[PDB]
Ligand binder design. Structure first.
Ligand SMILES: *[C@@H]1O[C@H](CO)[C@@H](O[C@@H]2O[C@H](CO)[C@@H](O[C@@H]3O[C@H](CO[C@H]4O[C@H](CO[C@H]5O[C@H](CO)[C@@H](O)[C@H](O)[C@@H]5O)[C@@H](O)[C@H](O)[C@@H]4O)[C@@H](O)[C@H](O[C@H]4O[C@H](CO)[C@@H](O)[C@H](O)[C@@H]4O)[C@@H]3O)[C@H](O)[C@H]2NC(C)=O)[C@H](O)[C@H]1NC(C)=O
Ligand SMILES: *[C@@H]1O[C@H](CO)[C@@H](O[C@@H]2O[C@H](CO)[C@@H](O)[C@H](O)[C@H]2NC(C)=O)[C@H](O)[C@H]1NC(C)=O
Ligand SMILES: *[C@@H]1O[C@H](CO)[C@@H](O[C@@H]2O[C@H](CO)[C@@H](O)[C@H](O)[C@H]2NC(C)=O)[C@H](O)[C@H]1NC(C)=O
Lengths: 259, 52
C-alpha cells in the first residue's frame, strides 16, 4: 500500500522540476524562471516527458555525469560570475534568438550571454575568475557553430576563431565548424554546451577570438548525505514520510515491499 | 624555430597525431607551460615510429 502522492521527507520539500529537465534548469531556460532562486531540498522530481531543455539545438557534453553529480547535492547558491553590463564593454551583449520563445517574443537563456560584434570589430577576449566561496562552483558555457561563412563573417568578422578554457584540472581548446545541417526547431546552426566544477582556491581562464556564449550566472553547490532523483507523475502534497517511491509514500515497519 | 609543429606516433595498434597549443595558463609549481605524457605497449615483433 502507498499514498499515491509525492510529499515531504524529514521536513524538507522536494524540488519539482515541472516541465523542465536538468539542462533547462542549469542553463536557464526562459520557461524555467521559477527554479532560479536560492533554495534547498531533499530530493528532485522529474516529469517523465519534459520538453523544455536545450531550446537551441546542440550537444550537451557529459549530460549523465552532470546528473550523477547533481544527485548528491543539497543546496545551491546562484551568484553572478560575470556582470553583463560591466565585463563586456567592447561587445554587444544583446543577443536574442527565435528558437527560444518567451511571452510571444524572442529571448535567450538566463545564465548565458551571446556576444556579437560592436562597431564592426570583434576584439580579443580574455577573462579570469578566482573561486573564494569555500565550496565548488559549477560553470557553464557554449561554443557556436554557424551554418555558412556569411553568418560567421557578419557576426564575428573572422573566418577562423577559437575558444580556450583553462583551469587547474580543465584544459581544452575549441574550434568552430561550418557545414550544412538539417533543421531542428527552425534553425540550422548549433550551439554546443559545456560545464565544469571549480574547486576552492582555483582559477578559471576564458580566452576567445570568436564564437563564445559567455557565462553570466554560476552555482555554488553544497553536498549532503541523502538525496536522489525520482521520475514520477504523482501530485505533490503534505506528509512527513521517511520513505519515498515514484508511485507514492510508505509508512510501516515491515521488512519487505513489492511496490 | 617554427610557429607550427606536430608529433606523430605510429604502431600497428597505435596511430596518433599531436598538435601543440599555446595559451595563458594558471601557474602550477612555478611554470605556466605544460607537458602531456603518453604511453603504449609494444607487442613482440612490432615496430614503433616517431615523427616530429
Ligand atoms: C567547394 O567548397 C569550398 C569550401 O566549402 C569552396 O571554397 C569557398 O568558396 C567561396 C566562394 O568562392 C569563398 O568565399 C569567398 O571568400 C573571398 C575571400 O574573403 C576575403 O574578404 C572578406 C571580406 O569580407 C566582406 O565580404 C563578405 C562576403 O564575402 C561579407 O560576408 C563580410 O561581412 C564582409 O563584408 C574577408 O572577410 C575574408 O576574411 C577574406 O579576407 C571573398 O572575396 C569572396 O567574396 C565574393 O563573394 C561574395 C558573396 O559571397 C560577394 O559579396 C563579394 O563581393 C565577392 O564577389 C567570397 O566570399 C570561400 O572563402 C571558400 N572557402 C575557403 C575555405 O576558402 C569552393 O568555392 C567550393 N567549390 C565550388 C565550385 O563551389
Ligand atoms: C517548452 O515546451 C513546450 C511544449 O513542451 C514548447 O511548445 C512547443 O513549441 C514547438 C516549437 O518548437 C511547437 O511546434 C509546439 O506546438 C509547442 N507545443 C505546445 C504544447 O505549445 C515550447 O516551445 C518550449 N519552450 C522552450 C523555450 O523551449
Ligand atoms: C543568492 O545568494 C547569493 C550569495 O551566495 C546572493 O548574492 C549576494 O547578495 C548580497 C546582496 O545583494 C550581496 O551583498 C553579496 O555580495 C552577494 N554575494 C555574492 C557572492 O554574490 C544572492 O543575492 C542571493 N539571491 C537571492 C536572494 O535569490
Amino acid at each position: 500500500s502507498h499514498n499515491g502522492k509525492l510529499c515531504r521527507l524529514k521536513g524538507k520539500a522536494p524540488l519539482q522540476l515541472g516541465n523542465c529537465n536538468i539542462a533547462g534548469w542549469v542553463l536557464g531556460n526562459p520557461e524555467c524562471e521559477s527554479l532560479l532562486s536560492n533554495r534547498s531540498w531533499s530530493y528532485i522530481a522529474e516529469t517523465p516527458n519534459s520538453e523544455n531543455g536545450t531550446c537551441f539545438p546542440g550537444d550537451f557534453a557529459d549530460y549523465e555525469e552532470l546528473r550523477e553529480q547533481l544527485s548528491s547535492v543539497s543546496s545551491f547558491e546562484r551568484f553572478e560570475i560575470f556582470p553583463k553590463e560591466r565585463s563586456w564593454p567592447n561587445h554587444t551583449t544583446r543577443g536574442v534568438t527565435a528558437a527560444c520563445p518567451h511571452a510571444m517574443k524572442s529571448s535567450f537563456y538566463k545564465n548565458l550571454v551571446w556576444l556579437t560584434e560592436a562597431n564592426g570589430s570583434y576584439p580579443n577576449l580574455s577573462r579570469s575568475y578566482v573561486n573564494n566561496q569555500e565550496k565548488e562552483v559549477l560553470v557553464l558555457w557554449g561554443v557556436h557553430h554557424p551554418s555558412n561563412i556569411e553568418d560567421q563573417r557578419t557576426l564575428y568578422r573572422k573566418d577562423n576563431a577559437y575558444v580556450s578554457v583553462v583551469s587547474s584540472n580543465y584544459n581544452r581548446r575549441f574550434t568552430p565548424e561550418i557545414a550544412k545541417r538539417p533543421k531542428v526547431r527552425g534553425q540550422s546552426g548549433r550551439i554546443n554546451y559545456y560545464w565544469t566544477l571549480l574547486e576552492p582556491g582555483d582559477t578559471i581562464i576564458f580566452e576567445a577570438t570568436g564564437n563564445l556564449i559567455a557565462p553570466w550566472y554560476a552555482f555554488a553547490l553544497s553536498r549532503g548525505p541523502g538525496s536522489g532523483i525520482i521520475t514520477s507523475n504523482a501530485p505533490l502534497d503534505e506528509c512527513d514520510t521517511k520513505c519515498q517511491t515514484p508511485q507514492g509514500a510508505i509508512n510501516s515497519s515491515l521488512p519487505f515491499q513489492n511496490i
